[PDB]
Design a protein around this ligand. Sequence first.
Ligand code: CL
Ligand code: CL
Ligand code: CL
Ligand code: NA
Length: 164
Amino acid sequence: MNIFEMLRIDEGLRLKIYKDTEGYYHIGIGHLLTKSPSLNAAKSELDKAIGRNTNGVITKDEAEKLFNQDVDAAVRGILRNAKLKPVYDSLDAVRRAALINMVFQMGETGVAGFTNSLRMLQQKRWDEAAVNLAKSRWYNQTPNRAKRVITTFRTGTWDAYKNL
Ligand SMILES: [Cl-]
Ligand SMILES: [Cl-]
Ligand SMILES: [Cl-]
Ligand code: NA
């Protein structure tokens, strides 16, 4: 188990444009195309991202390319953020994956907003952080995924992703 396998479980794989739980156009392994309500806008973003006229469908190789790019971007976002980097640097490797997962889902800015949870993580107050993380729109909107990520922060193991 590693961050790529973890996010492939949480996001799935779809080779056609789809809407996520917020109703936004995505493709592949949780790649956000646009927040705009227009499917035409989303097709245009896709063709721009892939470099060809896709007509809304990509191959598995294309999905995995976007995914590699997106994981790299999430990591870079953490390291260039002054609120996230110190937390990341304090964490063990498994808990680092959990933080990358959150940034992949919500973005660098959204996670940097979890001020109190971040402080608790930096202090290694795992049970207190777990409770605080669950008091969120995030948890209420995507509770099964939030629970897996929170369990990962609580325990520092991959147990939530085992048996899946
Ligand atoms: Cl892109
Ligand atoms: Cl709390
Ligand atoms: Cl969920
Ligand atoms: Na994403």
